[model samples]
Target chain A: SSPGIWQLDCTHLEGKVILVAVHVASGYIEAEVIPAETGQETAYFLLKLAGRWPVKTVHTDNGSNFTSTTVKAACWWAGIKQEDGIPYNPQSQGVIESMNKELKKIIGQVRDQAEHLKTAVQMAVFIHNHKRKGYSAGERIVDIIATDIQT
Target chain B: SSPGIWQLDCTHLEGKVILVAVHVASGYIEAEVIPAETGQETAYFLLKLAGRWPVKTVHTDNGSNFTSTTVKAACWWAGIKQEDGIPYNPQSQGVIESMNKELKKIIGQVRDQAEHLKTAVQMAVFIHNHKRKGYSAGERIVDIIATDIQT
Candidate 1:
């Protein structure tokens, strides 16, 4: 449930979307794109996607929307434990925290060259989840998740 | 003192140097190079270089060499505070973290069809410190450092 603000920019695109994702395990990721200013419905949708897996713990930052009653109610119904990282501390949720940098690099590489930013973003995620090797830690968590999913 | 591991690939040339730098208040960076597997010396040299700056803090991961006694002594001598991020947390030093990715992208773009990795790395650092905008605080720390050096 570790969450952070993900910024997506496409020079040739008219609009941008923010994606929120959860790292269920090493390789299993569930993500969805929501409107720039996300709210209850967005959280509800996020929770619903997360429900696809048996969520036991959800970690996020101290965003107002994440702590909203709507999000809390959904977590309660799902019997999930919602954990918020320390306020103003981005290090708490390191999974997606580092992803921000990778996202920016991939986007910058594809900017203006690609017909759509969404396509670039999809490609970025696909590569990150499948192609790149984790530093120090061999084979990315995504690979682990793929194995789990297959099993 | 916060210690971080930066992977610089200087493997292309017959004989090239990888310059590893550390500075406080972004002043003159202390740089050096050792053979690849020289993590022990990397930590040792970084500790010696830390003396050149009034380093109050350091951030790094659980790299064995960085956690060695040589580095500890350097921090102790300089009275610098040291902090480490969790095992998988790369955002612990998010300030310069994104720069690493940007550096890699610049290297790929500028050295297209070129095999000289060392020169590419040097060029990347020069551009980063002198030309690129600082990502975190939105200020060119290199410019600030230049003015300080001139004064």
Candidate 2:
């Protein structure tokens, strides 16, 4: 295994560690593979995702990847505050768990169809981000440019 | 002051401690006042909101409202979990901050047009949840469902 991606010889890999970012507002998710969850890797992935949309805050478990100086510095400049869940308690992370569970559920649904765990996760990430949550489609983060002052 | 509402006067009340729930994916919010941030109030608020749309998970700050027996009973019966953020940290609640900020911003925009604080907040809450966020004069959450099934 190399540094960033888990599966080597790159055809398909099954049952590996992955990192996912869940958008609190929309219940959307962005996910990818990392060789391991290290501070450097966490910082790199967070920056990449934040580039798509400016990330304001990040929530994670009490893991080193989030706590490390590497991620701290990266997020500091990027203006993303990385937040860890309470120690010894998992229930308070309901929002993070909400979409994380959904991504896992997607992999479960596609186990037979997807060539491997990687493809399943990617497809699930895709489905969850768009037209899938089945809740708020066509509604987007509005950039209100002009408002009419009512008489 | 009342069983469900925190306001002392039965008539339109303002500047009350409110409970808000935001869907992570859609950036949508459900909010109302409660008797207190105790488990009973939390449960009551959550169940009332769930009547409109089923909630799967709840993430909150290290407040007693979520950690107490009342919320425990409510979430247990509702088949939900109450997750708490780090005790000292507020930013770990990225999602909570997201729409709640949106709600506050909406009120700030309408305070002058509205007569009272309660009126302003109601107007703001109305605007926050609807397409009046606004790609709309009037669009709803159901449209989100119908469009997904189409094309």
Interface RMSD of each: 22.5, 17.1
List runs of model 1 lying over 4 Å from the truth: A1-17, A22-30, A87-97, A112-114, A134-151, B1-151
lDDT tens string, model 1, A7-90? Answer: 111112236554544353443233333445445544454444332333456655346655677667655645567666453555
Give the per-residue lDDT digits (tens) of candidate 2, residues A1-151: 0101110010113435677765444444556666666776666556544433335667654467556887787577456767764534555355455556666777688666544455556556545544433344112221111111111
TM-score of each: 0.36, 0.39
Q: What is residue A106's positional error in candidate 1, in angstroms?
A: 1.1
Provide the RMSD of all predictions against the true structure, rounded to 1 decimal.
21.7, 21.2
lDDT of 1 by residue, B68-121 (tens): 665565456445555553435554356445544565676676565234464355
In model 2 chain B, the worst 10-residue window by lDDT is B1-10
| Runs off by more than 4 Å, candidate 2 | A1-15, A87-92, A131-134, A137-151, B1-151
Error of 2 at B112 (Å): 52
DockQ numbers for every candidate? Answer: 0.01, 0.01
